[PDB]
Amino acid sequence: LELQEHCSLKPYNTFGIDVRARLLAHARDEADVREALALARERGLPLLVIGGGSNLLLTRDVEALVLRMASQGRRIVSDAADSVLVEAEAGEAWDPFVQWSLERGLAGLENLSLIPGTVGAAPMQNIGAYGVELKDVFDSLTALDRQDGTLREFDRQACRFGYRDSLFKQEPDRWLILRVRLRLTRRERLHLDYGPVRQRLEEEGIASPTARDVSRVICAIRREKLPDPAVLGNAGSFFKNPLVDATQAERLRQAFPDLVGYPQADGRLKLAAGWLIDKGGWKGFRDGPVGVHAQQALVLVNHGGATGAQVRALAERIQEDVRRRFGVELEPEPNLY
Ligand SMILES: Cc1cc2nc3c(=O)[nH]c(=O)nc-3n(C[C@H](O)[C@H](O)[C@H](O)COP(=O)(O)OP(=O)(O)OC[C@H]3O[C@@H](n4cnc5c(N)ncnc54)[C@H](O)[C@@H]3O)c2cc1C
Ligand SMILES: O=C(O)c1cnn(-c2ccccc2)c1C(F)(F)F
Numbered sequence: 363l364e365l366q367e368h369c370s371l372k373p374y375n376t377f378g379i380d381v382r383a384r385l386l387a388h389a390r391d392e393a394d395v396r397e398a399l400a401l402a403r404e405r406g407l408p409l410l411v412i413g414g415g416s417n418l419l420l421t422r423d424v425e426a427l428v429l430r431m432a433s434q435g436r437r438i439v440s441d442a443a444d445s446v447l448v449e450a451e452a453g454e455a456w457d458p459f460v461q462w463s464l465e466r467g468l469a470g471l472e473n474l475s476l477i478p479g480t481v482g483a484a485p486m487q488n489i490g491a492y493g494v495e496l497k498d499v500f501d502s503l504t505a506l507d508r509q510d511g512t513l514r515e516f517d518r519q520a521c522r523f524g525y526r527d528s529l530f531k532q533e534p535d536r537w538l539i540l541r542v543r544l545r546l547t548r549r550e551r552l553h554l555d556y557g558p559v560r561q562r563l564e565e566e567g568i569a570s571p572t573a574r575d576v577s578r579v580i581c582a583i584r585r586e587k588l589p590d591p592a593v594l595g596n597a598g599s600f601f602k603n604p605l606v607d608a609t610q611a612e613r614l615r616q617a618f619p620d621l622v623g624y625p626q627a628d629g630r631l632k633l634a635a636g637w638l639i640d641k642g643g644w645k646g647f648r649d650g651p652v653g654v655h656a657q658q659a660l661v662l663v664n665h666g667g668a669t670g671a672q673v674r675a676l677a678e679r680i681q682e683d684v685r686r687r688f689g690v691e692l693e694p695e696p697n698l699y
Contacts, residue, residue, distance in 0.1 A: 378595030452482025
């Protein structure tokens with residue numbers, strides 16, 4: 363289990379927060395998972411599940427058994443020609459899993475290229491980028507019920523996916539995701555809305571891009587645009603794009619013509635949270651070891667040595683400021699512990 367007592371979690375979270383865990387364990391299959399659960403209950407410690415720690419804000423030492431999800435395995439479950447059911451263990455790194463699928467001639471994940479973290483965590487916040495969400499390709503997952511240690515299958519409906527949401531984020535600490543099955547395709551027409559990805563592919567002379575072509579562009583753009591936690595600690599975008607009803611939307615639009623929004627299919631307008639933050643004057647803000655990125659206004663950052671409490675406090679000031687200015691509450695994307 364590679365059990366360690368009073369272990370620094372600093373290399374295990376992309377924010378780079380240095381808090382200690384009472385017990386740190388690395389799980390490399392379901393047996394290790396069941397063992398750690400027995401251990402946590404034996405020692406009367408809660409169990410905190412961690413993947414790549416890239417959606418995690420740790421604010422204090424962790425009096426719990428921290429289980430690092432490191433199980434390995436990727437496989438084609440069944441080939442149906444135009445679609446292919448693939449399966450990966452929870453501890454599989456997400457982006458190497460995307461590449462594994464693309465090397466196999468499968469499409470569906472290319473817009474989710476270069477997202478950090480693990481396969482296991484991906485259903486929890488319904489990972490999404492470039493107009494694609496995990497739920498678009500999701501077939502099923504196997505999860506351990508942490509109430510009674512049974513195994514349950516969740517199909518797409520049972521997962522109650524939502525924008526950066528899922529049953530598992532709503533019922534926290536209840537389900538331990540062990541492996542995830544996705545339906546990828548071959549020979550589908552690549553649907554790409556106007557934007558920088560499509561523009562770069564046109565520049566490369568590519569009017570019918572393969573999934574691999576799309577993935578190469580999106581990797582390049584993300585490596586150009588998004589701070590790397592390796593250099594500057596962060597958990598990606600800190601806030602979700604908030605929705606407003608047509609009432610608040612027309613009022614905010616009357617107060618700001620430059621208001622960057624997205625009209626939804628249900629009639630509401632999803633606001634661009636980075637615009638709220640930028641126009642709050644927050645872009646590039648720094649306060650000691652924490653700050654907001656000078657260009658990606660959604661990315662709160664640890665310049666080095668920050669505590670999670672310092673990050674949370676900065677997030678709270680931005681939230682309160684945006685509340686006080688725009689009448690809009692920014693929800694966080696990372697999970698705070
Ligand atoms: C630079 C950077 C860029 C990012 N870009 C995006 C993006 O474009 N789109 C997007 O959606 N997200 C993005 N993220 C957020 C993060 O990468 C995703 O949310 C990812 O799915 C988190 O996976 P993880 O393994 O690191 O989860 P962790 O951070 O390790 O865990 C996050 C939550 O999931 C729980 N959890 C983890 N594994 C399991 C498991 N097997 N079973 C049950 N619960 C579990 C954890 O308890 C925790 O609550 C980015 C993060 C960073 C640092
Ligand atoms: O929608 C997208 O296409 C997209 C493209 N990059 N990032 C992004 C990811 C992490 C930090 C900041 C931005 C997004 C998203 F997270 F906002 F979702």
